[PDB]
Design a protein around this ligand. Structure first.
Ligand SMILES: [Br-]
Ligand SMILES: [Br-]
Ligand SMILES: [Br-]
Ligand SMILES: [Br-]
Ligand SMILES: [Br-]
Length: 275
């Protein structure tokens, strides 16, 4: 599939930088014809068949195809796609309130503040999983706030760079995110499905409530070993006034066997969440 090959600068003016990954940079931008503001994500293309630099066309097209499907208040949306020899440029919805990761860093929360974030994340993932989309990179860095200066900020899930359609219940590709957040099946290179996201939500919930990361070791290999062994516990210093029901929610997500793990539907009916 090909994209718009006109110069993006003929249609948009870029401004401040919003984010910066390994093969991508995101710039605030403004569309000349409407005055409307967006986030332009510049993804570096692979320059040869066998290079390790840049993103393969297959991978870029997958991200774009998935993004084109989605329209939900808790997920980023795609406006337009441009490309040139060097980059594919995704014109995405602007989410200007910063990462949940940075919001947490200024602030740990009350259980109400945590469930207020978590419920929006669950709604977004419910939508994605209903479309058989596994995100595969859920972590606080990939949750963006619309406005961080309100008591209950609204959020959107971003960064669909590892997202896959799961049409046979599982996929068996080269897929591996950030050690602190990946499920044991990722660590062990096993077939992956929607369940991996639910583990990640468990990790996010643990961090939301405590300010601490449940499997984090001193090196990435230690973290991965900890994940595979389900080596986490609820430290009393962090969880002493956290409800047992909150712990129950986490405990039912941080389960090694993906079949025994709560699904997104389970998570919305769980007594800590269910209205
Ligand atoms: Br700007
Ligand atoms: Br579902
Ligand atoms: Br993004
Ligand atoms: Br790590
Ligand atoms: Br699910």
């Amino acid at each position: 599939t090909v994209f718009r090959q006109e110069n993006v600068d003929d249609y948009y003016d870029t401004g401040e930088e919003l984010g910066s990954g390994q093969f991508a940079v995101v710039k605030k931008c403004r569309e000349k014809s409407t005055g409307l503001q967006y986030a332009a994500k510049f993804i570096k293309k692979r320059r040869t068949k066998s290079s390790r630099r840049g993103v393969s066309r297959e991978d870029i097209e997958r991200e774009v195809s998935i993004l084109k499907e989605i329209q939900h208040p808790n997920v980023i949306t795609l406006h337009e796609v441009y490309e040139n020899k060097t980059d594919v440029i995704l014109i995405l919805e602007l989410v200007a309130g910063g990462e949940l990761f940075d919001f947490l860093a200024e602030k740990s929360l009350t259980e109400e503040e945590a469930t207020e974030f978590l419920k929006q994340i669950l709604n977004g993932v419910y939508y994605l999983h209903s479309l058989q989309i596994a995100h595969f990179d859920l972590k606080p860095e990939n949750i963006m706030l619309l406005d961080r200066n309100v008591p209950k900020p609204r959020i959107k899930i971003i960064d669909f760079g590892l997202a896959h359609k799961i049409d046979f219940g599982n996929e068996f590709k080269n897929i591996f995110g950030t050690p602190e957040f990946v499920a044991p099946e990722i660590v062990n290179y096993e077939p992956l499905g929607l369940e991996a996201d639910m583990w990640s939500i468990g990790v996010i919930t643990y961090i939301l409530l405590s300010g601490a990361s449940p499997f984090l070791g001193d090196t990435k290999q230690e973290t991965l070993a900890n994940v595979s062994a389900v080596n986490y516990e609820f430290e009393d210093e962090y969880f002493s006034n956290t409800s047992a029901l909150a712990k129950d929610f986490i405990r039912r997500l941080l389960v090694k066997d993906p079949k025994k793990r709560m699904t997104i539907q389970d998570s919305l009916q769980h007594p800590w969440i269910k209205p």
